[PDB]
Amino acid sequence: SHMKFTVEREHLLKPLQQVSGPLGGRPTLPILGNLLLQVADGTLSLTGTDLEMEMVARVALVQPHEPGATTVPARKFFDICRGLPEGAEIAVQLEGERMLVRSGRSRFSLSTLPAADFPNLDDWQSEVEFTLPQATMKRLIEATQFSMAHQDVRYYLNGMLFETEGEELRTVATDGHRLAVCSMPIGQSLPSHSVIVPRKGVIELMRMLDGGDNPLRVQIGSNNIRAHVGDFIFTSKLVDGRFPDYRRVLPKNPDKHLEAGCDLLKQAFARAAILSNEKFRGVRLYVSENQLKITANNPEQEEAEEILDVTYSGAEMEIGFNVSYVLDVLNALKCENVRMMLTDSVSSVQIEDAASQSAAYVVMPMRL
C-alpha cells in the first residue's frame, strides 16, 4: 500500500488510546488485535474493533502524506508512540507487508495484516437522531450502569436500555435483583423508541466523554447505535432482545417513607457490612419513629449495630438487604438526603434523592 504520513506524537496518543478501547482481553482472531489505519483526503483514520463495537478517531494530516491503508498491532504501535520523546515527529510508511515507523534515531518494523481483511461494522441506516450535551449522557450512564447484569444468562440484561420519550432520554439497567432508571430532558421532540446497548459498549461510550463545548450526536438504527464526539465516532451493535418494563417493577403503593442523610446512611451500611456474611452480605434494617437500626452478623457470631436519626413516622418494620446493592445506590446518589419508600419485608424498596426524582432505584430485599 502507498500509505505514508508524518504526525507529531501528541496528536497520535489520545486517538490511539481511544480506538484501542474495544481491544481485549483474550485474543480471538489476530487481526482483532490490530488497528486499521487509513489515509485519504488529508485525513488519518484509526479504527479498533471487537466485532461487536468499534471506535474510530480522525486526525488531520498537515504534513505531506500519501493515501492507503493497513492494519498494525495496537499495543506495540501504541507503546512505540508513547515511548518516544515529547514532541517527536512519527513517520510511517509501508514496505511490502511491513510497517516502518521512524522518529529521529529510532526505527521500528511492524508486521501488518491487509486492511481488506479488517472486520469493520457493515453499512446500516439511521432511524432516530438527536444531539445532547456530553454531561447529560455521562450522568445518565453513571446513574444506572452499576445495576447492569454481568454475564447473566438473560443476555438482554448484560447491557443498558436507552429509551427516548417526548423530550427525555432515559436509561434503565437491571440484573433481576436491583434496578436503576434515570431520565434527562433533551430539549428536542423524539419518537418513542427503546434499544439495548451491550454493557461493554456502554462502558466505552462513558469513557469517550471527555471534551468541552463539543456536543454529542447520537444515531440509532434498527441494529446499531452511533455516538459522535469531536473527532471520535463510537459504533455498537444493539442487543436483540426484550427488556423488562421498569414501569412494572416500581413499588406500586409504598405507604412508608424514610428520609435520611446520604453520607451518614452510606457510612453506617459500610461499617455494618464489615461483620456481615462474606458471601451473602446480608444486613438487617429496623425502622421506627425517627430511628433506623442496621445490624449485621456473620458465621463467626460477630455482630455490628448502627443507629441513625431519620425522618420516619410509619409503622415499624424490619427488612433485610444485600448491603452491596444498597451501597451501590447510595454511592451513585451524590446528594444530601435520600428517600426510601417501603411496603413490607417481602417487597421491593424504591430509593431516590430526596430533592430530585430524575433517578430512581429499586432493590429487592432478602429473606431475613
Binding site: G176, P244, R248, V249, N322, M364, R367
Partner: peptide
C-alpha cells in the same frame, strides 16, 4: 435474595 421479575 428475592427477584424483581
Amino acid at each position: 435474595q428475592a427477584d424483581l421479575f
